[PDB]
Amino acid sequence: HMQFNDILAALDIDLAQWKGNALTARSPLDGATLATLAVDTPADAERKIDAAHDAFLKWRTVPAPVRGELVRVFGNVLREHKAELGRLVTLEAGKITSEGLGEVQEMIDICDFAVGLSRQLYGLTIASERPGHRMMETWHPIGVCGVISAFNFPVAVWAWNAALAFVCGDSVVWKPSEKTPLTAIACHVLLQKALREFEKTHPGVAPAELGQLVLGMRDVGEVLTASKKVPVVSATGSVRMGQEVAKVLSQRLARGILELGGNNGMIVAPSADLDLVVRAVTFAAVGTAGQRCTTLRRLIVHRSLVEQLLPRIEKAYASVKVGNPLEEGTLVGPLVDRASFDAMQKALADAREQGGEVKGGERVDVGHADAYYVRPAIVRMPKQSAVVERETFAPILYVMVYDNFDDAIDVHNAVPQGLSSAIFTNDMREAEQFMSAAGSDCGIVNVNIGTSGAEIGGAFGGEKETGGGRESGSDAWKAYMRRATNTINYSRQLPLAQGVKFDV
Amino acid sequence: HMQFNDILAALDIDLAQWKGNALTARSPLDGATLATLAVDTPADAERKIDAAHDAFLKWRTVPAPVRGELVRVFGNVLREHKAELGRLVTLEAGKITSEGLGEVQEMIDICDFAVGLSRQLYGLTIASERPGHRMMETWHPIGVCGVISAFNFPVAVWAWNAALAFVCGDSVVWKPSEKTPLTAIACHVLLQKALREFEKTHPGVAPAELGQLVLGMRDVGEVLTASKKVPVVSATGSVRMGQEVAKVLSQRLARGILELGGNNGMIVAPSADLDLVVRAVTFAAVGTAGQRCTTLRRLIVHRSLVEQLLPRIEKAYASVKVGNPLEEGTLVGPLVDRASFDAMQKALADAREQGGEVKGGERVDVGHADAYYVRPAIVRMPKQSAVVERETFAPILYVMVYDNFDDAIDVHNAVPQGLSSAIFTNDMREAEQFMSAAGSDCGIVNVNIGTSGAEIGGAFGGEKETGGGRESGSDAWKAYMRRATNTINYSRQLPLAQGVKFDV
Ligand SMILES: NC(=O)c1ccc[n+]([C@@H]2O[C@H](COP(=O)([O-])OP(=O)(O)OC[C@H]3O[C@@H](n4cnc5c(N)ncnc54)[C@H](O)[C@@H]3O)[C@@H](O)[C@H]2O)c1
Ligand SMILES: NC(=O)c1ccc[n+]([C@@H]2O[C@H](COP(=O)([O-])OP(=O)(O)OC[C@H]3O[C@@H](n4cnc5c(N)ncnc54)[C@H](O)[C@@H]3O)[C@@H](O)[C@H]2O)c1
């Protein structure tokens, strides 16, 4: 049990430098104010973008393996402060202590992955059709990387973008969610510590302005997306946010990494391991109070399994501990705020109007009118009606029955989102069909592991309204750089004159 | 010498099936009407998009090597009709006979390249951190591929997109420039011939509606870009077109391959091979009457070379034959239309107001008031002023002097476009600096080969206002498919209960 001021002190955060009376930093745990903060003006945001661009001009000529060493040092700083940073994630995002720790560990893991990439950043050498010419494809730092992040992963989304961007020779301007500024301040402070350690061993190499933190409301978010000095913006959030950002990027022909909403489903086929299913369903649907973008929200269960499987899931649901995420034993912490609670209860009301039968979903009183805890809900639906197609960012699992596998695929694919997906089956034919071109239409398509089944090494992102961006693994790093095709003529041969007078 | 009706007959085009009184197909050679055509209504366009989507649903499960066989057959059909199709390109786009032939040969070359890709389409198998799990990245046909193309490469741009899209399991809906419909009709007719040959050896495999041709004005172009059944649109044209298309794509969170304008420059450094430079400059600047998107428009010449080099370029310029592109000896055919001529003369007027000294640029009378031939212009400019930053799609080469190499790079990079670029030097240090992160900012960056130096095997496209899309070589094919990250759990191990009641 570390108090809030102990956390700040252990992170070496001096709140006096960030205090103000513009932005209230609230804890979902009890609704209490953690601190009140100053915010950037639009002009402040522009100035920070100018400084990040100057930083980029220096950083882009630093050898990438040297750039990776800063990221390696940053990984070690995060390791040293993992417990306190994780606790801050719990206080501000409301997730249980182990998920706070787990989210910081994701930051650390991507640092080490990016260190590996810092010795790669592979283009190609390519055969040329021209005699005495050589051809290659090279990759180059692109410029300032804007990062717009959501409340629910307040540190790992930024780390995923910044580790890659720094290794790729970019500076970063970060505008975190106005709901989670304190975790962002902490990350920024820990980065400054990394830069100080790196400056000891690499004097003059890293620009002090490499990472920028912009705190505030829509006005500074709009400065960032409209800035002609920011050639790529990674934007994580709602579908509506992504549409608006993409419109601004398009107007100035800039690049987007769009990581928008999910509405993730699982098909449970007749041969599924039910002992495995009941656990995988429960944990993916109720984890983080249904506030992961990969949260399981749709369950498509074969008719032969309903009578066996559903009472087991209901039994697990009822035994899940909802409570303050600081307590040992808690599995489900609070929803982030009232708007989230209201949208949940509205979704459930819609579900009932649409023929659904709701279990769970009621509010859990913890003694605070401005803290919103709920029992996870599981809703038997006669079809995948309008409410099921909405992403309600809350623990609601809609259950639909299917008979024919092709029909289950169609139902699975019929929502407008396309982030993650899973099939539980032991039949290799169904598993492969689900992963095939006519199967799941999502960016993440898993077999016998739930919809949060993803790791550093894989490209992370989705299709359809999820926006098409990819982060983290595979060659996602290319989105932080610009491709060049180079043809080099080392021949002394002159082109044919074609009757043109070239003689001296 | 093949007459127009001979060309149609040899291509097996029955004009009676395409004739109408909506769209006039005009030849830039003499301004004459070649034919008057029917056009698609918005509803026609929607119906064709529906048919292409149905075609996609069938084609996406055809093995890619089988899909490549259709493209191989298409390549052979193009070989058989190369002379006549090339002649049609000359009549409609106005380029000289060898460039008409050369453009069709690009279609043929990309077919064979796509045949190779049809046995690849590589994703990854990737280590997983989870015991008893396997992870991989797979690629899948994405859906209908919209293709919007420009007048000046009326057949190769479509071929570049369609060869890859077909091999990648996509259908194609093509809306060619309203300025070059007849070349598009020919390509579509030749594709139908390929489908008939393929149907003999592969009965029932390829959907008849795999390729669609949409002829008409903005109204059908806007149906295509707004269609929710078209997940990717490849758009080749002006910067303004690309901005408008990208806005529509963004609103529905769809993917763009944007191939917009260039404003391509060459740095000539003190050690350059001047015999080589004078030829490379002349051919890249005046070729196709300055109507390539890679046309050389800006020359940044070291002061020590000006007195030697510029009279040699002027001498070559004056000897260039401007005339009807059907004539042997012609190097420079006509501008496409009056609007192009007027914009050229306006640019030259602006250049003079901005201190420039113009040579060439006057109209060449060929006896037709509606045919626009010009002498290529070369303009000595005191600086890279406002007119030089505009892309004027005409043969105007602006010449700026430089002293310091870093300053030349800044001037080279100061325009808003970013397609292709070149440095002519024998100094390896300058050549590498130009290709480095702080060098040319373009998508194509060449050494001792001009700004049209590109080939099938390289990714083709640019940065900045050029829009960021890539076509043809390297892994450009990924833009026609959707990535999936697959994690497969084949372990029998249950997750920890975490105190949740899972027992039966
Ligand atoms: N795809 C992913 O990787 C991923 C990861 C985490 C969360 N999410 C999604 O995020 C959502 C939950 O996060 P949220 O509630 O914070 O979303 P949100 O859209 O309300 O806000 C996300 C961020 O965008 C900013 N923003 C909003 N509108 C903006 C605009 N027009 N211009 C500039 N900035 C703007 C916000 O200030 C915030 O920083 C869910 O839909 C969830 O699925 C997706
Ligand atoms: N980047 C490349 O690979 C490449 C290749 C060839 C040409 N170009 C560029 O193309 C331009 C010359 O071609 P152009 O004069 O035909 O260009 P353009 O922009 O006038 O037209 C291109 C195509 O877009 C269509 N179009 C225009 N506005 C549209 C809209 N709002 N919605 C839908 N469709 C729309 C036109 O009908 C035509 O088919 C130059 O700028 C040149 O640099 C680029």
Total Cβ atoms within 10 A of residue B240: 11
Characterize the bridge pairing of strands B255-259 and B232-236. Answer: parallel
Beta bridge partners, B182, equal none
Q: Which residues of A belong to the annotated binding site for (6S)-NADHX?
A: 149, 151, 175, 238
Three-state SS sequence of B215-260:
CCCHHHHHHHHHCCCCCEEEEECCHHHHHHHHHHHHHCCCEEEEEC
CB contact under 8 A, A275 and B319: no
Nearest CA to ligand 1 atom 36: A177
Protein residue with its CA nearest to atom 27 in ligand 2: B241
A434 C-alpha to ligand 2 centroid (Å)? 39
Q: What angle do CA A338, A341, A345 make, to 5 degrees?
A: 140
Catalytic residue, candidates B106, B259, B465, B471: B259
**What gap in Å lies between CA A76 and CA A108, rounded to an integer?**
8
Structure tokens given for B403: 């002293």
**Which strand (E) or helix (H) includes residue B195?**
helix B181-201
| Helices and strands (DSSP H and E) totals, chain B | 15, 21
B393 assigned binding-site residue: no
Return the ∠ at Cα A417 (arms to A416 and A420), rounded to 5°.
Answer: 145
Of B434, B435, B450, B393, residue with least CA distance to B417: B393
Catalytic status, residue B293: yes
d(CA B136, CA B133): 10
Among partner residues B251, B441, B449, which is closest to A247 by beta-carbon distance? B251
Q: Where in chain A is the domain with CATH 3.40.605.10?
A: 1-261+456-504
- Indicate which of A109, A110, A487 best probes the interface with B, i.e. most B CBs within 10 Å of its own CB: A487
Where does residue B272 fall: left (phi above 0), alpha (psi -120 to 50 degrees), or beta otherwise?
beta
User: Phi/psi of residue B476, each to 5°?
Assistant: -55, -30
**CB A419 within 8 Å of CB A263:** yes
List the single residue in B126, B446, B495 with the smallest CB-CB distance to A487.
Answer: B446
Beta carbon of B463 within 6 Å of any ligand 2 atom: no
Whether the CB-CB separation of A82 and A105 falls below 8 Å is answered with: yes
Closest by alpha carbon to A341, among A368, A366, A381, A371? Answer: A371
How far is residue B70's CA from residue A360's CA, in Å, rounded to a whole number?
Answer: 56
Residue A254 is given by DSSP the state: -
3-state secondary structure of B299: strand
Q: How far is CA A190 from CA A81, A86, A214, in A?
A: 8, 13, 16
Q: How far is CA A488 from CA A481, B171, B268, B410, in A?
A: 22, 36, 15, 21
Whole-number Å distance between alpha carbons of B245 and B256: 8
- B385 assigned binding-site residue: no
SS3 A384: coil
Parallel/antiparallel/unpaired status of strands B377-380 and B396-402: parallel
Beta-carbon contacts of A284 under 8 Å, excluding residues fewer than 6 positions away, are: A264, A266, A294, A295, A296, A422, A450, A451, A452
Task: Find out whether the beta carbon of B425 lies less than 6 Å from any atom of ligand 2.
Answer: no
How far lies B15's CA from each of B37, B89, B216, in Å?
9, 17, 16
* Tokens describing residue B432: 């590498």
Name the token pair of A114.
Answer: 């990016």
Nearest to residue B156, comparing CAs of B182, B178, B184, B179? B184
CATH code: domain A262-455 is 3.40.309.10
Residue A80: both structure tokens together: 């040293």
Distance CA A371, CA B143 (A): 45
As annotated, the residues of chain A forming the CATH 3.40.309.10 domain(s) are: 262-455
CB–CB contact B455 A130 (8 Å): yes
Structure tokens at A349: 């009301």
CA distance B146 to B48: 11
Nearest to B465 among A253, A276, A456 (CB): A253
Report the CATH architecture of B1-261+456-504. Answer: 3-Layer(aba) Sandwich (3.40)
CA B177/CA B184 separation, integer angstroms:
9
* 3-class DSSP state of B12: coil
Integer CA distances (angstroms), B429 to B271, B433, B439, in order? 11, 6, 12
Backbone dihedral region for residue A355 (phi beyond 0: left; psi -120 to 50: alpha; all else: beta):
left
Q: Which residues pair with A259 in a beta bridge?
A: A236
- Ligand 1 pocket, Cβ-based, cut-off 6 angstroms: A 148-153, 175, 177-178, 218, 221-222, 225, 236-238, 241, 244-245, 259-262, 293, 391, 393, 419, 466
**DSSP label at residue B466:** G
Residue A503: partners with Cβ closer than 8 Å, 6 or more residues away? none
Question: Which ligand approaches the C-alpha of residue A239 most closely?
Answer: 1
Token duo for residue B394: 């005409």
Nearest to A419 by CA among A378, A390, A452: A452
Inter-residue contact A400 to A410 (CB < 8 Å): no
Distance B177 CA to ligand 2 centre (A): 8
Closest residue (by CA) to atom 34 of ligand 2? B221
**Residue B149 is labelled as binding a ligand:** yes
Per the rule left: phi > 0, alpha: psi between -120 and 50, beta: everything else, B499 is left
What resolution in angstroms, rounded to 1 decimal?
Answer: 2.1
Q: Is A133 helix (H, G, I), strand (E, B) or coil?
A: strand
Name chain B contacts of A247, Cβ cutoff 8 Å.
247, 250-251
- Distance CA(A297)–CA(A287), nearest Å, equals 11
Q: B485 and A260 in contact by Cβ < 8 A? A: no
Bridge partners of B36? B24
Which tokens in the block code for residue A221? 């978010």
Cα torsion B152, B154, B159, B162 to 10°: value is 110
Task: Give the residue from chain B lying closest to A311, CA to CA.
Answer: B504
Q: What is the CA radius of gyration of chain B?
A: 25
User: Residue B464 CA: which ligand is closest?
Assistant: 2
Which whole-number Å values give the CA distances from A56 to A52, A144, A208, in the listed order? 6, 6, 11
Which residues of chain B lie closer than 8 angstroms to A482, CB-CB? Answer: 441, 443, 463
**Backbone phi, then psi, for A426, in 5-degree steps?**
-105, 5
> What angle (nearest 5°) sits at the alpha carbon of residue A407, between those of residues A405 and A408?
65
Q: Output DSSP code: residue A466.
A: G
What radius of gyration do chain A's Cα atoms show?
25
d(CA A495, CA A396): 70
What are the residues whose beta carbons fall under 8 Å from the beta carbon of B216, sequence distance 6 or more? B22, B23, B39, B40, B41, B45, B175, B178
What technique determined this structure? Answer: X-ray
A82 neighbors A100 (Cβ within 8 angstroms): no
The tokens for B399 are 């010449």
For chain A, the first-to-last Cα distance in angstroms comes to 86
Q: Which of A151, A326, A160, A148 is nearest to A244 (CA)?
A: A148
Q: Report the C-alpha gap between B487 and B466 in whole angstroms.
A: 37
A192 min Cα distance to partner chain B (Å): 26
Exposed/middle/buried for residue B332 (C-beta within 10 Å: 0-12, 13-18, 19+): buried
Type of residue found at B496? L
Task: State how far residue B34 is from chain A, nearest Cα, in angstroms.
Answer: 30
Q: Would you say B221 and B180 are in contact if contact means Cβ atoms under 8 Å apart? A: no
The four Cα atoms B417, B420, B426, B431 give a dihedral, to 10 degrees, of 70
The Å distance, Cα A235 to ligand 1 centre, comes to 7
Q: What is the b/e burial string over B294-307, where b = at least 16 CB atoms within 10 angstroms of the residue's CB?
A: bbbbbbbbbeebee
Cα B242 to averaged position of ligand 2 atoms, centre (Å): 8
Asked if B454's CB is within 8 angstroms of A487's CB, the reply is yes
**Beta carbons of B488 and A243 less than 8 Å apart:** no
Axis-axis angle for helices A97-117, A64-80 (nearest 10): 160
Taking one residue from A and the other from B, the number of pairs with CB-CB distance under 8 angstroms is 262
* Three-class secondary structure of residue A244 per DSSP: helix
Known catalytic membership, residue B111: no
Residue B393 near ligand 2, beta carbon < 6 Å: yes
Ligand 1 pocket: which of A236, A419, A472 to mutate (most atoms <8 Å of CB)? A236
Which of B124, B129, B465 is facing A474, going by the closest CB pair? B124
Q: Which residue is it, tokens 């899940």? A: A320
What secondary structure letter does DSSP report for B285?
A: H
Test the B interface: residue of A483, A492, A496, A501 with most B CBs within 10 Å: A483
Q: Specify whether the CB–CB gap between A442 and A462 falls below 8 A.
A: yes
Nearest to A468 among B255, B444, B499 (CB): B255
